[PDB]
């Protein structure tokens, strides 16, 4: 009841490129996927929350065109970091929650994906 996958598990790209990273969940309902960004030597931080048929709602410091979120199919959410810069290097982790509740409602995490930008 809710496993969440990610793809790739690590990618190394050149400056200025755009990198597409994936969050998968087989079963079943899932009304929100969240995306999180951990910098090296730093904390895991919410970047955005994507409600199921809406555009994602971005946290402070995150811009939609720099970290584009596409919740294309109901089980697949993609994040793409565009115009990649070394400072975007980090672990990117998604996570799902199961409706409805709020608040006092469990979050299932992906395994995470390492981006390194040269």
């Amino acid at each position: 009841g809710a496993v969440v996958s990610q793809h790739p598990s690590m990618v190394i790209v050149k400056s200025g490129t755009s990198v597409k990273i994936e969050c998968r969940s087989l079963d079943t309902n899932i009304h929100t996927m969240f995306w999180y960004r951990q910098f090296p030597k730093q904390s895991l931080m919410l970047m955005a929350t994507s409600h199921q048929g809406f555009n994602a709602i971005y946290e402070q410091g995150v811009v939609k065109d720099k970290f584009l979120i596409n919740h294309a199919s109901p089980t697949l959410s993609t994040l793409t970091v565009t115009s990649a810069h070394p400072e975007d290097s980090g672990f990117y982790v998604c996570s799902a929650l199961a409706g409805s509740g709020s608040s006092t409602d469990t979050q299932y995490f992906g395994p995470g994906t390492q981006l390194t930008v040269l």
């Binding site: 555009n55 709602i57 971005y58 811009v63 939609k64």
Partner: protein, 191 residues
């Protein structure tokens, strides 16, 4: 108050499609088939902006959703959107629209202010793009000293448009898309 509604609207993502096909166009409504090959049902409440694009013409979208996009039997993913339809005229290379921000009377350097490759953008789209820059980098709606202000465009010919930051874009007031290469300055002040 309504400032949280403003935040979720402007701090959120947007839809951008290139080269979609019009199948229906009336008063303040268009049914557009995108290249994915989703359906977009887009309203145009402003009498001063009803795209003249006819069935089969190509259009670009830079729109926000009015509610939950719908379902799938065939994986077809119907969107319910508002404004933001333009022609497919492209610019030779992407340009950065000149935008300067001030809070509170002090310069606030830009970050992830993107470039555009299109000749025209809807005024609603420039709004939600300017404000998104503002909500994401400059504290708009996120702090109590940062709830209002303005943004203001100035065209090469002296024309100015100004939008009050403390109120939502008045979509029923909206005029036709402008050539963004004709924009001289954009200024934004959260004060």
């Amino acid at each position: 108050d309504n400032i949280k509604d403003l935040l979720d609207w402007y701090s959120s993502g947007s839809d951008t499609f290139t080269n979609s096909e019009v199948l229906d166009n009336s008063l303040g409504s268009m049914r557009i088939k995108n290249t994915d090959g989703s359906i977009s049902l887009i309203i145009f409440p402003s009498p001063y902006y009803s795209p003249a694009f006819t069935k089969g013409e190509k259009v670009d979208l830079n729109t926000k959703r009015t509610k939950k996009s719908q379902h799938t039997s065939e994986g077809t993913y119907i969107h319910f959107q508002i404004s933001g339809v333009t022609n497919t005229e492209k610019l030779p290379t992407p340009i950065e629209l000149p935008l300067k921000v001030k809070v509170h009377g002090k310069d606030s350097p830009l970050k992830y202010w993107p470039k555009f490759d299109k000749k025209q953008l809807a005024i609603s789209t420039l709004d939600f793009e300017i404000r998104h820059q503002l909500t994401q980098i400059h504290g708009l709606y996120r702090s109590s000293d940062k709830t209002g202000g303005y943004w203001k465009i100035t065209m090469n010919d002296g024309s100015t448009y100004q939008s009050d930051l403390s109120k939502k874009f008045e979509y029923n007031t909206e005029k036709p898309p402008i050539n963004i290469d004709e924009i001289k300055t954009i200024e934004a002040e959260i004060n």
